[PDB]
Amino acid sequence: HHHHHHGSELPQMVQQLNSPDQQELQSALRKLSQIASGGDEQIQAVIDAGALPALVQLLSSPNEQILQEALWTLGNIASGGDEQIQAVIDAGALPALVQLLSSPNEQILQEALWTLGNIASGGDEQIQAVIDAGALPALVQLLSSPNEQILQEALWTLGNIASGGDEQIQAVIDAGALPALVQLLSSPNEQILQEALWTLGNIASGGNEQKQAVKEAGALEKLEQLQSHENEKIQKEAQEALEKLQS
Ligand SMILES: [Ca+2]
Ligand SMILES: [Ca+2]
Ligand SMILES: [Ca+2]
Ligand SMILES: [Ca+2]
Ligand SMILES: [Ca+2]
Ligand SMILES: [Ca+2]
Ligand SMILES: [Ca+2]
Ligand SMILES: [Ca+2]
């Protein structure tokens, strides 16, 4: 598409996020999400127009049509630079995001997990905020989910968190992730095995204390077994995870 210089148009769209006309509101929210899907430059224009605090208030809305679009906007902003991610944090998104991990609406749940995952793909500061906001217990609980679509998104977000510093990995371990991940390594669903290996791999690349807890949990047995799985992608992923574990 096309270069557009957003004038005063962008702060004006932001104002309509507090309009009592939901059709104006939705229109603005749609345009913002489309903007936010561009690069870091487009994202920055949305931040600089003051969109973050208006978006965050919409995360309390009982209107799922508004909420889904606001989440999508925030997830996209969080796909930017670490400071763009921090902006989202600084605007108070995380408490609402964590409380949305309890939604019975799977579409909302997934969007919230996705957004969280994006924020957690940031630097150690951004990951720490996710941890401090109490995301881990819900995340570990979702590893027991029978909804494979939700499971994959929870595994990805955990994986991102476990891409942080050793104490951040330890945080994941202290929340109980290892037993759930080890159980997942016996799934007869190879898609799940791959997703679990990615996450477990990340954990296994922490320091000695994290590497040891990985062994205490029973992962080596499973990893060694999976070295010879029929599926050559799984073989490669179990090999990568085992190699990471042993550095
Ligand atoms: Ca109205
Ligand atoms: Ca720029
Ligand atoms: Ca509703
Ligand atoms: Ca439902
Ligand atoms: Ca990153
Ligand atoms: Ca299912
Ligand atoms: Ca400790
Ligand atoms: Ca199978």
Residue numbers in the entry: 4 to 250
Paper passage:
The crystal structures of His-YIIIM4AII and His-YIIIM5AII were refined at 1.8 and 2.0 Å resolution, respectively. The coordination number of each calcium ion in His-YIIIM4AII is seven, which agrees very well with the statistical analysis of calcium-coordination geometry in protein and small-molecule complexes. In contrast to many natural calcium-binding sites, where all coordination bonds are approximately equal in length, the His-YIIIM4AII calcium-binding sites are distorted. In His-YIIIM4AII the axial calcium–ligand distances are shorter than the equatorial distances (axial distances 2.1–2.2 Å; equatorial distances 2.4–3.0 Å) and the Glu25 OE2–Ca bonding distances differ significantly from the average coordination bond length. The structures of His-YIIIM4AII and YIIIM5AII represent extreme cases that are most different.
In order to develop such a system, three crystal structures of designed armadillo-repeat proteins with third-generation N-caps (YIII-type), four or five internal repeats (M-type) and second-generation C-caps (AII-type) were determined at 1.8 Å (His-YIIIM4AII), 2.0 Å (His-YIIIM5AII) and 1.95 Å (YIIIM5AII) resolution and compared with those of variants with third-generation C-caps.
